[PDB]
Amino acid sequence: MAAKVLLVEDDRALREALSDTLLLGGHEFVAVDSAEAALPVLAREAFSLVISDVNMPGMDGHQLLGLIRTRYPHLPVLLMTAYGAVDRAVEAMRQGAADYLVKPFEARALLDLVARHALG
Protein backbone atom coordinates (compact mmCIF):
# COMPACT_ATOMS: atom_id res chain seq x y z
CA MET A 1 0.00 0.00 0.00
CA ALA A 2 3.07 2.17 0.50
CA ALA A 3 4.39 4.67 -2.03
CA LYS A 4 7.98 5.88 -2.22
CA VAL A 5 7.86 9.68 -2.49
CA LEU A 6 10.72 11.99 -3.45
CA LEU A 7 10.25 15.28 -1.61
CA VAL A 8 12.05 18.38 -2.93
CA GLU A 9 11.67 21.43 -0.69
CA ASP A 10 14.23 24.06 0.33
CA ASP A 11 12.21 25.15 3.39
CA ARG A 12 13.41 23.11 6.38
CA ALA A 13 10.15 23.65 8.24
CA LEU A 14 7.74 22.64 5.47
CA ARG A 15 10.03 19.76 4.47
CA GLU A 16 9.81 18.23 7.95
CA ALA A 17 6.04 18.69 8.25
CA LEU A 18 5.62 17.05 4.83
CA SER A 19 7.87 14.18 5.90
CA ASP A 20 5.79 13.83 9.07
CA THR A 21 2.62 13.54 6.99
CA LEU A 22 4.12 11.02 4.57
CA LEU A 23 5.09 8.72 7.46
CA LEU A 24 1.63 9.11 8.99
CA GLY A 25 0.26 7.69 5.75
CA GLY A 26 2.53 4.63 5.77
CA HIS A 27 4.76 5.95 2.98
CA GLU A 28 8.48 5.73 2.26
CA PHE A 29 10.22 8.92 1.28
CA VAL A 30 13.48 10.70 0.57
CA ALA A 31 13.70 14.46 1.22
CA VAL A 32 16.16 16.82 -0.50
CA ASP A 33 16.44 20.59 -0.49
CA SER A 34 17.18 21.32 -4.15
CA ALA A 35 16.34 20.04 -7.61
CA GLU A 36 20.13 19.68 -8.01
CA ALA A 37 20.16 17.31 -5.03
CA ALA A 38 17.13 15.48 -6.41
CA LEU A 39 18.82 14.42 -9.66
CA PRO A 40 21.51 12.11 -8.14
CA VAL A 41 18.85 10.50 -5.96
CA LEU A 42 16.50 9.99 -8.92
CA ALA A 43 19.24 7.97 -10.61
CA ARG A 44 19.85 5.85 -7.48
CA GLU A 45 16.33 4.87 -6.45
CA ALA A 46 12.96 4.31 -8.09
CA PHE A 47 10.13 6.51 -6.85
CA SER A 48 6.37 6.42 -7.14
CA LEU A 49 5.89 10.18 -6.95
CA VAL A 50 7.81 13.45 -6.98
CA ILE A 51 6.60 16.48 -5.05
CA SER A 52 8.69 19.57 -5.66
CA ASP A 53 8.61 23.20 -4.65
CA VAL A 54 8.68 25.63 -7.55
CA ASN A 55 10.82 28.45 -6.07
CA MET A 56 14.21 27.18 -5.01
CA PRO A 57 17.75 28.54 -4.63
CA GLY A 58 19.00 27.00 -7.84
CA MET A 59 17.15 25.20 -10.59
CA ASP A 60 13.42 25.74 -10.25
CA GLY A 61 10.61 23.20 -10.22
CA HIS A 62 9.46 23.93 -13.76
CA GLN A 63 12.93 23.04 -14.99
CA LEU A 64 13.01 19.98 -12.75
CA LEU A 65 9.57 19.04 -14.13
CA GLY A 66 10.60 19.15 -17.79
CA LEU A 67 13.71 17.24 -16.83
CA ILE A 68 11.74 14.50 -15.09
CA ARG A 69 9.29 14.29 -17.97
CA THR A 70 12.28 13.65 -20.23
CA ARG A 71 14.34 11.12 -18.27
CA TYR A 72 11.52 9.38 -16.30
CA PRO A 73 8.46 9.47 -18.56
CA HIS A 74 6.51 7.20 -16.17
CA LEU A 75 7.03 9.32 -13.04
CA PRO A 76 4.15 11.48 -11.72
CA VAL A 77 5.22 14.94 -10.55
CA LEU A 78 3.34 17.36 -8.32
CA LEU A 79 4.42 20.97 -8.19
CA MET A 80 3.79 23.15 -5.16
CA THR A 81 4.31 26.86 -4.78
CA ALA A 82 3.70 29.75 -2.44
CA TYR A 83 3.23 32.10 -5.42
CA GLY A 84 0.58 30.62 -7.68
CA ALA A 85 0.07 31.92 -11.20
CA VAL A 86 -2.49 30.75 -13.75
CA ASP A 87 -0.19 30.86 -16.78
CA ARG A 88 2.54 28.78 -15.10
CA ALA A 89 0.00 26.30 -13.71
CA VAL A 90 -1.30 25.87 -17.26
CA GLU A 91 2.22 25.33 -18.57
CA ALA A 92 3.00 22.73 -15.90
CA MET A 93 -0.22 20.81 -16.62
CA ARG A 94 0.38 21.02 -20.37
CA GLN A 95 3.81 19.47 -19.68
CA GLY A 96 2.25 16.62 -17.71
CA ALA A 97 2.51 17.66 -14.07
CA ALA A 98 0.02 15.65 -12.03
CA ASP A 99 -1.10 18.79 -10.16
CA TYR A 100 -0.04 22.33 -9.37
CA LEU A 101 -0.52 23.20 -5.70
CA VAL A 102 -0.63 26.57 -3.98
CA LYS A 103 0.67 26.40 -0.40
CA PRO A 104 -0.41 25.69 2.24
CA PHE A 105 -2.48 22.51 2.37
CA GLU A 106 -3.48 20.27 5.23
CA ALA A 107 -1.68 16.98 5.90
CA ARG A 108 -4.75 14.94 4.99
CA ALA A 109 -4.85 16.67 1.58
CA LEU A 110 -1.27 15.59 0.86
CA LEU A 111 -2.12 11.97 1.61
CA ASP A 112 -5.09 12.21 -0.76
CA LEU A 113 -2.78 13.66 -3.44
CA VAL A 114 -0.36 10.71 -3.04
CA ALA A 115 -3.16 8.15 -3.28
CA ARG A 116 -4.65 9.87 -6.34
CA HIS A 117 -1.33 10.24 -8.20
CA ALA A 118 1.48 7.95 -7.02
CA LEU A 119 2.23 4.81 -9.02
CA GLY A 120 0.55 1.78 -7.47
Task: Among 24, 40, 55, 58, indicate the residue that binds Ca ion (CB under 5 A).
Answer: 55
- The whole-angstrom separation of Cα 50 and Cα 47 is 7
Taking the least distance from each CB to Ca ion, the nearer of 10 and 99 is 10
* Binding residues for Ca ion restricted to 10-39, rule: CB under 5 A: 10
**Residues that contact Ca ion, how many (by CB under 5 A):** 4
Task: Among 53, 64, 68, 98, indicate the residue that binds Ca ion (CB under 5 A).
Answer: 53
The contact set with Ca ion (CB under 5 A) reads 10, 53, 55-56
